[PDB]
Amino acid sequence: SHMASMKKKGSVVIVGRINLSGDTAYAQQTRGEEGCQETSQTGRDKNQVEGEVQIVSTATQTFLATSINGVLWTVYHGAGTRTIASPKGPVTQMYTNVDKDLVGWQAPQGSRSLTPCTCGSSDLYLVTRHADVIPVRRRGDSRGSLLSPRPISYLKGSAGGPLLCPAGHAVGIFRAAVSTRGVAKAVAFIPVESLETTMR
Ligand SMILES: CC(C)(C)OC(=O)N[C@H]1CCCCC/C=C\[C@@H]2C[C@@]2(C(=O)NS(=O)(=O)C2CC2)NC(=O)[C@@H]2C[C@@H](OC(=O)n3cc4cccc(F)c4c3)CN2C1=O
Ligand SMILES: [Zn+2]
C-alpha cells in the first residue's frame, strides 16, 4: 500500500470518573469531546486523575477502566492494543490478553487502586458508567446474576468497570452481558485472580 499516508490509532483518553469517595456514587466528566479528540491524537493528557474507576474513550467507543494493584485495567474489545494518553505522551500497554478480553497500563499518577478481594464472598456490586451500583450474586468463577434484571442498554459502555465485594475490594472486571430478549440477567467478568496471574 501507500505507506506514507498510513494512519496511526489514537490513544485511549480518560474523560471522566465514577466518584465513589462519598456516600453517593456519581459520574464526573473531566474532558469534553474536542479536548478528547486532540488528546487522543497527541497522547498528551495533562489533566489531573483521581479515583479508582475512570471513564475512557477512543474515537469510536466509550467504556470504563479500573485501577487494581497499581494497574489501570480495561477490556480488549474497547481498547484493542492502544496506548493511553498521559502527561508525557502515549503509554504502551503493560498487559494485553485477548483471550481474557483484558488490557492494562501502569495506573496514572493521582489514581487510587482497589485492593484485590480475598473475602470469598458471593455478594457483589457492579459499578456502571452511570454510577449505578447494581447488586450481583456471584454464580461461578466468572459469572454473576443481576438481582434485578434490566435492559442491556443500561450496561452498555460499562465494560472495564469493577465488581466489588461488600467491603469494596475488587472481585472482577466486567466484560460481557448475558441476555435474553435484550434483558441482561447475568454478567461475565474477568476474576481478580486472573488479573493477579496475568501480573505474573
Ligand atoms: C461472552 C458471552 C457470554 C457470549 O456474552 C456476550 O458476548 N455478550 C455480549 C452482549 C452484547 C450486548 C451489549 C451488552 C452490554 C454491555 C456489555 C459489557 C459490554 C460493554 O458494555 N461493552 S462496551 O460497550 O463498553 C464496549 C466499548 C467497550 N461488553 C460487550 O458488549 C461484549 C463485547 C463482545 O464480547 C467480546 O468481544 N468478548 C471477547 C471475550 C473474550 C473472553 C471472554 C469474553 F466474555 C469475551 C467477550 C460482545 N459483548 C457482550 O457483552
Ligand atoms: Zn473483599
Author numbering: 981 to 1180
Give the article text:
Telaprevir potency was slightly better against D168A relative to the wild type, while danoprevir, vaniprevir and MK-5172 lost 100- to 1000-fold potency against D168A. Among the macrocyclic drugs, danoprevir and MK-5172 retained higher activities against D168A (D168A IC50 = 48 nM and 13 nM, respectively) relative to vaniprevir (D168A IC50>400 nM). The D168A mutation also disrupted stacking of the P2 moieties with R155, by disrupting the electrostatic network and therefore the position of R155 for optimal cation-π stacking. In danoprevir, the P2 isoindoline moiety shifted in response to R155K and D168A mutations, making extensive interactions with the catalytic D81. Thus, D168A caused losses in danoprevir and vaniprevir potency by disrupting cation-π stacking. However, the flexibility of the P2 moiety of danoprevir compensates somewhat for this loss, explaining danoprevir's greater potency against the D168A variant relative to vaniprevir. Interestingly, while both drugs lose considerable potency against R155K, danoprevir retains higher activity against D168A. This difference is likely due to the flexible P2 isoindoline moiety of danoprevir, which lacks P2–P4 cyclization and repacks against the D168A variant. Danoprevir's isoindoline moiety bound in two conformations in the wild-type complex, but adopted a single conformation in mutant complexes. The flexible P2 isoindoline moiety of danoprevir containing a P1–P3 macrocycle packs against the mutated surfaces of A156T and D168A variants, explaining its relatively higher activity against both protease variants.
The HCV NS3/4A protease – a chymotrypsin-like serine protease – is a prime therapeutic target that cleaves four known sites along the virally encoded polyprotein. The NS3/4A protease also hydrolyzes two human proteins, TRIF and MAVS, which are part of the innate immune system, thereby confounding the innate immune response to viral infection. In this study, we report that four chemically representative protease inhibitors – telaprevir, danoprevir, vaniprevir and MK-5172 – exhibit distinct susceptibilities to the protease variants R155K, A156T and D168A. To elucidate the underlying mechanism by which chemically diverse inhibitors bind to the wild-type protease and drug-resistant variants, crystal structures were determined for 16 inhibitor-protease complexes. These complexes include wild-type protease and resistant variants R155K, D168A and A156T each bound to telaprevir, danoprevir, vaniprevir and MK-5172, with resolutions ranging from 1.10–2.50 Å; S139A protease variants were used except for telaprevir, which requires covalent bond formation with the serine 139 for efficient binding.
